[PDB]
From a paper:
The mutually antagonistic relationship of atypical protein kinase C ([name]) and partitioning-defective protein 6 ([name]) with the substrate lethal giant larvae ([name]) is essential for regulating polarity across many cell types. Although [name]–[name] phosphorylates [name] at three serine sites to exclude it from the apical domain, [name]–[name] and [name] paradoxically form a stable kinase–substrate complex, with conflicting roles proposed for [name]. [name] has a double β-propeller structure and contains multiple phosphorylation sites for [name]–[name], with at least three serine phospho-acceptor sites (S655, S659 and S663 in human [name], within a segment defined hereafter as the P-site) that map within a key membrane-binding loop13. The structure reveals the intricate interplay between [name]–[name] and its substrate [name], which, together with in vitro and in vivo data, supports a capture-and-release mechanism involving a stable phospho-intermediate.
Numbering used by the authors:
A (entry chain L): 15 to 122, 139 to 420, 427 to 485, 495 to 667, 704 to 761, 771 to 951
B (entry chain I): 248 to 585
C (entry chain P): 154 to 180, 186 to 252
């Protein structure tokens, strides 16, 4: 080989896409104008501007909840559920600007805060004590420390007799002047304390359990919250030192039991009414379980009701000490499943759209599809449909994107439990949402569903499921003629035209019986959806040509189209069929179940399903466990599931005529090839070629026909795209079939093993997913050979060379553990792939040496 | 004395994990009862003799509650280990879910409240039931629930203490078990939340997810990651009160869950809106009216059980052929009698 | 090692006659091992007689098992299932 492979492929990861999993901490910096998010997985991501991202991940993968930025400086503090604290530092690596850890701190824990101009940090613990740190060098200053006995020495007359001061909490920073810290103790006691003179400047009394403190930029008044639904408002002056009773103390929702308030922010010093924003406080007896933030100004109070738990919130405002305005432009809130931002310029306070960090999960992701080299006419039609279906300002606008404009328009498109397809800009560093198609509009509903709290519902994330069988099982898209097929859980399959005009039409629906001649097993599972009859209004965008339905409403495990021929194939747990959309008659249907069965004709709950046992040191009692060993058999599993549906123009009958053909593939290892008679009064006819039956019965996962130049057959309508696509016809074709444990290729007029490879024999493995891809060389890209990439059940990716079936590389892409990540994969045709490392996020890998991506940013530190 | 010859074996009514349930009749007193058979050769581990011995202790502690089942006779003949127990006339709740598919909220509220009283009785006495399951729940002829396999329970739990053994059916294991935490009776309230969803929706919330089919989907390595890491979503058709019960039991953090507070937990279950309709005193009594009354066909309601069981042959399985050299013939004594 | 055992194609309905387990083995050099465990009745492994419930498997089809999991070795034997060879350690059966 002499290293010729290294021009073709090498393995990389790229940074993730979509909202972070298990969010936990937040920071914002008004002077760099950047935001950071901390997460229970130990991640520290940063989201400063469109196309800007960074990511730390600590040495120790512990949970976090505190983050602070040194405002205007290359550094951040992040606090762990552990005793530890450590400093993150951002550096302009010459291309690849990145975050890296500087220094570590320890004590023999609860909150931290920082000071501007008088550059100091302060920490608070679970004991009633406060400590000070110069952030320049991670240590406490041994003299600047504040024990409970010192702050107790001041004592008001009720507390003079008692020493039992509760936990330190809610350290709040300075307020224009450089040396004052505000301190809370959960008991209800509140102090303002001076660093430069080591003394109390004022006390504030309090009696109920505490959980917030706040400062106003002009210190005429301050606000605090209590863990009983109350909040204390206080004024400050040099004569107010004894602080006998609060100035404006209240609970905002009536005489009722009303939970707790966990944060307050104060924005009152602007022109107009008293902006106050707070989390919790809702009446527990009627509005207890739900997650909400209340915003008050003057007589206008609204509660913002969120579909997931609130982590933290911040307001867009200026830290310049010479400013006199609290300047609240926008409020941003981190929920457990979304980040929302809302602008307060106009009454009713509009939500603001997000350029990044989208909630991909908002209905659960059921499938991944990808298309590459997309036509500019189609892309313009898709974004025109997107913008047609869909002050306005984005505040988080710090650093700058240095990456290139897309030279390869890749689209990743995804199906969701809601019966919706979403389109995403897969090109370059990050996704953007293009468009959203709802299939759900076709089907009738089988089932169906200010006040005292001033409620308005906000966030795109939905915690409810519409129907279990609207969900999209497979998607495929035909770039060259703007047609898409989508397939669902109740045997529905839609083919849709892209038509960038609003119009009203009635679909044609067909139903096909897989067991038509075969005797009826009794389907007691999912009852079929009923399409709404008569004409329906449709949006400019994808609109359904026709609907097809399967007799048993099983999950459509496979679908494909060959648009030149005008065919679609669809395949279920029980059988497959062909349909021509040009003349509406079905071409064929076939059942491929064994003549008796177990995992079929049943409801969603059943006694028979036995779950294959774990081998971990978790998940079992403390230590041997049994697994059996056995040759596969004709009824060992759900053996009638259809995995492949493939179209090819190939010599199957005889070597003279290049006839158009379709290939099914099944869990049984049965490969029904069919010949087709396309017309140009008459309709397509189909007849069985050679059934190929595998020697080991392992499920077929992919079928690809190699044209006699060793190049796969092209994509369907590619005769509109190139000369170079035109296949060989003079040399006889071979068919490649991938089973779950070995690959074979065969010569189509006489099926004989040209080449074979057995992975699992040499090392314990199985193949989950297969796709064929091309590898243009990093230089002299004229050398652009083809390979199949296979995803192992251990999460490894292996690349095999066609037709030779030799393993080129052996790479550890995904872990053994994340089976839902392995099951989510799609491959781009250029040796790149997407997988779901969380239901919230896609991670991306590249194994082509030419197609690669890196972080590439700069910032005015 | 008690032994296999007196009871005549009518039909198999349930095949379980490690046990066979037969409907059995007497002539000396004319009555009919269920009888559950365990295989003494199967329970050969030190852990097996412990779980089958402790199963007797749960019947010993469960001496009377209306929503449990009482040990009426016990015997250990010929490599088999027999518990004779109240015959349930109405089948298990799983078969009722196959026939009905979906329960309206008026039906589902009744069953979850009765199962809450049964669960609380074990917890309060010192038992964690550990394996609540849609087929462990049973119906009387009048439709009142019984909760009925006591094999995996934690015996002797002091109020506010915990356990560490990995246990229970995979669709219903609670997150704190899979993490490797020490756990209290919060796990039984998790399993009630799952079962309430299965009644109201007709599908597991922790189903094999609605993506298209793959192998390594029917593995517990997949399901355990689905229950740990994935969000859970309520059908938007459910009443808001029903959604709130499911969410509140479904909380992944045991401290957050409805009913999991170490003192006031059941009073929250009484006070929650969905439950606020129902009278807990009248619900322990005869006096509440169940919404559905199961079958009166056949000689004894044999039709209620699965075709897999209600067409099975009647013998104990024919013999211990060669196994007869290996078998135990005395060790399980002392938990032979009531 | 003592012997490598041919387990034949059945040519017929009869299964291969095994269940296998994880565990540990030692010389003080304690290490994981994969074991035979149940010679199931009427399966073709019982026709060979040199197998036992006691025995560790050291190689499958001449490939060393040493790094593999039990889930990987049942994969290495659900396929690879028409022409088995298995290599076993103890000569003394003690
Ligand atoms: N008293 C009873 N009356 C009627 N049916 C019963 C009775 N007890 C058990 N069954 C049925 O028998 C099945 C299995 O019995 P069970 O006592 O639960 O065995 P098991 O092995 O412990 N089952 P499992 O909980 O799945 O492990 C149940 O699901 C019911 O359908």
């Amino acid at each position: 080989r002499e290293k010729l492979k290294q021009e073709l492929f090498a393995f990389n990861k790229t940074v993730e896409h979509g909202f972070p999993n298990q969010p936990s901490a937040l920071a914002f910096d008004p002077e760099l104008r950047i935001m950071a998010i901390g997460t229970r997985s130990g991640a520290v991501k940063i989201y400063g501007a469109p196309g800007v991202e960074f990511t730390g991940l600590h040495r120790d993968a512990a949970t976090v909840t505190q983050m602070h930025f040194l405002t205007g400086q290359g550094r951040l503090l992040s606090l762990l559920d552990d005793s530890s604290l450590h400093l993150w530092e951002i550096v302009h690596h010459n291309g690849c600007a990145h975050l890296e850890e500087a220094l570590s701190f320890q004590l023999p824990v609860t909150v931290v805060l920082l000071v501007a101009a008088g550059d100091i940090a302060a920490l608070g613990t679970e004991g009633s004590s406060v400590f000070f740190l110069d952030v320049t060098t991670l240590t406490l200053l041994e003299g600047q420390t504040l024990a409970p006995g010192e702050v107790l020495r001041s004592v008001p007359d009720d507390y003079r007799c008692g020493k039992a001061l509760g936990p330190v909490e809610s350290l709040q920073g300075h307020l224009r002047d450089p040396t004052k810290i505000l301190i809370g103790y959960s008991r209800g006691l509140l102090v303002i304390w001076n660093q430069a003179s080591q003394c109390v400047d004022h006390i504030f009394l309090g009696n109920q359990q505490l959980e917030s403190l706040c400062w106003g930029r002009d210190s005429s008044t301050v606000v605090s919250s209590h863990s009983d639904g109350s909040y204390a408002v206080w004024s400050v002056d040099a004569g107010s030192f004894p602080t006998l009773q609060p100035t404006v103390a209240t609970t905002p929702y009536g005489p009722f039991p009303c939970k707790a308030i966990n944060k307050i922010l104060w924005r009152n010093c602007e022109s107009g009414g008293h902006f106050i924003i707070f989390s919790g406080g809702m009446p527990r007896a009627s509005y207890g379980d739900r997650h909400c933030v209340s915003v008050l100004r003057a007589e206008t109070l609204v509660t913002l009701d969120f579909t997931s738990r609130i982590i933290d919130f911040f307001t867009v405002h200026s830290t310049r000490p010479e400013d006199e305005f609290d300047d609240p432009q926008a409020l941003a809130v981190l929920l457990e499943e979304e980040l929302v931002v809302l602008d307060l310029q106009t009454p009713g306070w509009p939500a603001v759209p997000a350029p990044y960090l989208a909630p991909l999960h908002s209905s659960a992701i059921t499938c991944s599809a990808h298309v590459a080299s997309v036509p500019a006419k189609l892309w313009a039609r898709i974004v025109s449909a997107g913008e047609q279906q869909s002050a306005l300002s984005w505040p988080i606008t710090g650093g700058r994107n240095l990456a290139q404009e897309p030279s390869q328009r890749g689209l990743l498109l995804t199906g969701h439990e809601d019966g919706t397809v979403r389109f995403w800009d897969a090109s370059g560093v990050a996704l953007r949402p293009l468009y959203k198609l709802s299939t759900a509009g076709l089907f009738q509903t089988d089932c169906e569903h200010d006040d005292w709290p001033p409620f308005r519902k906000v966030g795109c994330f939905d915690p409810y499921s519409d129907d279990p069988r609207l969900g999209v099982q497979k998607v495929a898209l035909c770039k060259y003629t703007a047609q898409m097929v989508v397939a669902g859980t109740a045997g529905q399959v839609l083919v849709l035209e892209l038509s960038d005009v609003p119009v009203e039409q009635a679909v044609s629906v067909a139903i096909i019986d897989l067991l038509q001649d075969r005797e009826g097993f009794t389907w007691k599972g999912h009852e079929r959806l009923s399409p709404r009859t008569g004409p329906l209004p449709w949006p400019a965008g994808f609109q359904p040509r026709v609907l097809v339905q399967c007799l048993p409403p099983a999950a459509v495990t496979a679908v494909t189209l060959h648009t030149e021929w005008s065919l679609v194939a669809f395949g279920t747990s029980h059988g497959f069929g062909l349909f021509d959309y040009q003349r509406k008659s079905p071409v064929l249907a076939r059942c491929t179940l064994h003549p008796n069965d177990s995992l079929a004709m049943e409801g969603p709950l059943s006694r028979v399903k036995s779950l294959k046992k774990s081998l971990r040191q978790s998940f079992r009692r403390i230590t041997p466990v049994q697994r059996r060993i056995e040759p596969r058999s004709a009824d060992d599993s759900l053996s009638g599931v259809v995995r492949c549906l493939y179209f090819a123009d190939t010599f199957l009958r005889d070597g003279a005529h290049h006839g158009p053909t379709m290939w099914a593939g099944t869990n049984s290892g049965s490969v029904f090839a069919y010949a087709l008679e396309v017309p140009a009064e008459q309709a397509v006819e189909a007849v069985l070629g050679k059934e190929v039956q595998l020697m080991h019965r392992a499920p077929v996962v992919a079928i690809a026909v190699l044209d006699g130049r060793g190049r796969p057959l092209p994509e369907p309508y590619e005769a509109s795209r190139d000369l170079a696509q035109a296949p060989d016809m003079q040399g006889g074709h071979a068919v490649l079939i991938a089973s779950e444990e070995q690959f074979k290729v065969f010569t189509l007029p006489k099926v004989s093993a040209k080449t074979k490879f057995k992975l699992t024999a040499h090392e314990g493995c199985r193949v989950r997913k297969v796709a064929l891809a091309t590898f243009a060389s990093v230089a002299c890209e004229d050398y652009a050979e083809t390979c199949l990439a296979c995803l192992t059940n251990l999460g490894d990716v292996h690349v095999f060379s066609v037709p030779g079936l030799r393993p080129q590389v052996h790479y550890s892409c995904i872990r053994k553990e994340d089976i839902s990540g392995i099951a989510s994969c799609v491959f781009t045709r250029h040796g790149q792939g997407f997988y779901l490392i969380s239901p919230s996020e896609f991670e991306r890998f590249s194994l082509s040496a030419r197609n690669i991506t890196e972080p590439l940013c700069s910032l005015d530190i | 004395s008690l032994g296999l010859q007196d009871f005549d074996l009518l039909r198999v009514i349930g095949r379980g994990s490690y046990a066979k349930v037969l409907l059995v009749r007497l002539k000396k007193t004319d009555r009919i009862y269920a009888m559950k058979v365990v295989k003494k050769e199967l329970v050969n581990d030190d852990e097996d003799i412990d779980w089958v011995q402790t199963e007797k202790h749960v019947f010993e502690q469960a001496s009377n509650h209306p929503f449990l089942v009482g040990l009426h006779s016990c015997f250990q003949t010929e490599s088999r280990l027999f518990f004779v127990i109240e015959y349930v006339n109405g089948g298990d709740l799983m078969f009722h879910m196959q026939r009905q598919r979906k329960l309206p909220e008026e039906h589902a509220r009744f069953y979850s409240a009765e199962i809450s009283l049964a669960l609380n009785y074990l917890h309060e006495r010192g038992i964690i039931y550990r394996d609540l399951k849609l087929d462990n729940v049973l119906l009387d002829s009048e439709g009142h629930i019984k909760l009925t396999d006591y094999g995996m329970c934690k015996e002797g739990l002091r109020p506010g203490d915990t356990t560490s053994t990995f246990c229970g059916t995979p669709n219903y294991i609670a997150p704190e078990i899979l993490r490797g935490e020490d756990y209290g009776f919060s796990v039984d309230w998790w399993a009630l939340g799952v079962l309430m969803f299965e009644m109201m929706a007709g599908r597991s919330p922790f189903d094999i997810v609605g993506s298209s089919d793959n192998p390594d989907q029917n593995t517990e390595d997949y399901l355990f990651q689905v229950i740990l890491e994935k969000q859970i979503r309520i059908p938007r058709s459910l009443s808001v009160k029903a959604a709130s019960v499911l969410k509140s039991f479904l909380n992944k953090d045991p401290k957050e869950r409805l009913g999991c507070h170490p003192q006031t937990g059941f009073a929250d279950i009484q006070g929650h809106p969905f439950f606020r309709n129902v009278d807990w005193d009248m619900m322990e009594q005869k006096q509440v009216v169940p919404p559905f009354k199961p079958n009166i066909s056949g000689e004894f309601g044999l039709d209620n059980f699965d075709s897999q069981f209600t067409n099975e042959p009647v013998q104990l399985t024919p013999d211990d052929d060669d196994i007869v050299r290996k078998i135990d013939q005395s060790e399980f004594e002392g938990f032979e009698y009531i | 090692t003592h012997r490598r055992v041919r387990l034949h194609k059945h040519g017929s309905d009869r299964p291969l006659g095994f269940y296998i387990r994880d565990g540990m083995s030692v010389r003080l050099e304690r290490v994981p091992g994969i074991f035979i465990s149940r010679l199931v009745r009427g399966g073709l492994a019982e026709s060979t007689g040199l197998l036992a419930v006691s025995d560790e498997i050291l190689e499958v089809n001449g490939i060393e098992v040493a790094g593999k999991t039990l889930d990987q070795v049942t994969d290495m034997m659900v396929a690879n299932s028409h022409n088995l060879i298995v290599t076993v350690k103890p000569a003394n059966q003690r």
